[PDB]
Structures are given as C-alpha cells and as structure tokens.
Design a protein around this ligand. Structure first.
Ligand SMILES: [Ca+2]
Ligand SMILES: [Ca+2]
Length: 203
C-alpha cells in the first residue's frame, strides 16, 4: 500500500457564542484508517509537534484502527466541533485533516486553494449577529416620534423580544430617542431595526 488516505471536507462557518458540528469523510484504498489528525500546517514553535488552533476547535473520530472503517462505500467520519467563545476574533482559519493507513501513509498537506473542501478546509468565524435576522415587532404607539419617553422605549424593547424568541437570551435590546432599536448580542456585535417599523405617532 503506497496510497495515502483521501479526505472530503467543505467550507465551514461558525459563529461567536454558538456551538458547531461538522463531519469530514475519509477513505483509503485499503479500507482502514488508524489515525486522523486535524492540525495547523506549521509545528508548535516550542514542542516541535503538530498542534491545532484555535484551542476551541476540537475533533474526534470513532472506530479508528478497525478493518473496513474507511472504504469509499462507507467512509470514516471525523467530527469537527466546539463552542465559539464570545471574545475570540472574527476571521478565517485554514487547517488540514490528515489520516494515516496501516502502512503509515499519511495524507499530504498541500497549501493551495485547489485543495479546499478536500484535506484542506477553510473555517470562517463570523460575529454572532450574522446568525440571526431580527423580525419587526408589533408597533408601539408613542406621543412624539422624535422624543420617546423612558416607558415608551421600555415597551418597544419588550415588543422586540416578544417578536424575536430565537434571539440569545443574554442579548441586550436598547431603544434610542427616535425609536431606533439596537440588538447587542452577547459577543457585542449588533443588529438594528429602523424606527419606522417599530413605532407610530399616536395621533
Ligand atoms: Ca492506503
Ligand atoms: Ca443579523
């Protein structure tokens, strides 16, 4: 056996403050894979060993080291998962999935976008606001569209929550002097709802 295992992955998106779960598929001409490693291409400048960042990106593979566990008909599944911290940066990470067969052939890491979705994958970390699309609330009637009272602002905030049960429980809903709504997600990103869908002049 001189053929390394092959990997089929994809483009993975995750969101701060949210959990994620993706599955990559691994095959080998022998039908058996003994190890799968998800890793940065470069070695940890300290231990001289492979590592994986971000530290919140985890992986696990069931049924390693068993005959017939990685056939083209029934590929081996590696789970990539985690909970994205609220405080991590938003950005892209390009990482590699490398598997080893009984002959100790291991998938090669090739730094080329033409390998994206195979053994190389791009993990996009977006802000939490990008997971949600706030819905307009039932309008609140106000005396003056240019100068909302405290109680009118409170009522708008409640109306926005009532119409958006899917929003993170810890999101903060604030309302400006003209009825503009800001939804501040736990990761501090924001969405806005324009006043003209939220408030109406009483008269
Ligand atoms: Ca092989
Ligand atoms: Ca949004």
């Amino acid at each position: 056996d001189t053929e390394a295992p092959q990997v089929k992955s994809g483009d993975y998106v995750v969101y701060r403050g949210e959990s994620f779960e993706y599955y990559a598929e691994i095959t080998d001409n022998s039908g058996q894979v003994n190890n799968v490693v998800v890793r940065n291409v470069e070695l940890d400048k300290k231990t001289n060993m492979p590592y994986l960042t971000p530290d919140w990106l985890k992986y696990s593979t069931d049924n390693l080291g068993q005959p017939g566990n990685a056939t083209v008909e029934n590929p081996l599944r590696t789970k990539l998962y985690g909970n994205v911290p609220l405080d991590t940066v938003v950005g892209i990470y390009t990482r590699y999935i490398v598997a080893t067969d009984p002959a100790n052939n291991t998938t090669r890491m090739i730094q080329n976008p033409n390998r994206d979705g195979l053994e190389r994958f791009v993990l996009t970390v977006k802000s939490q606001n990008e997971k949600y699309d706030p819905a307009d609330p039932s309008v609140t009637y106000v005396n003056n569209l240019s100068n909302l009272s405290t109680s009118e602002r409170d009522a708008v905030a409640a109306a926005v929550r009532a119409a958006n049960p899917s929003l993170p429980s810890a999101a903060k809903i604030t309302v400006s002097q003209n009825g503009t709504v800001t939804i501040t997600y736990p990761d501090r990103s924001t969405d806005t709802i324009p006043a003209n869908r939220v408030v109406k002049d009483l008269q």
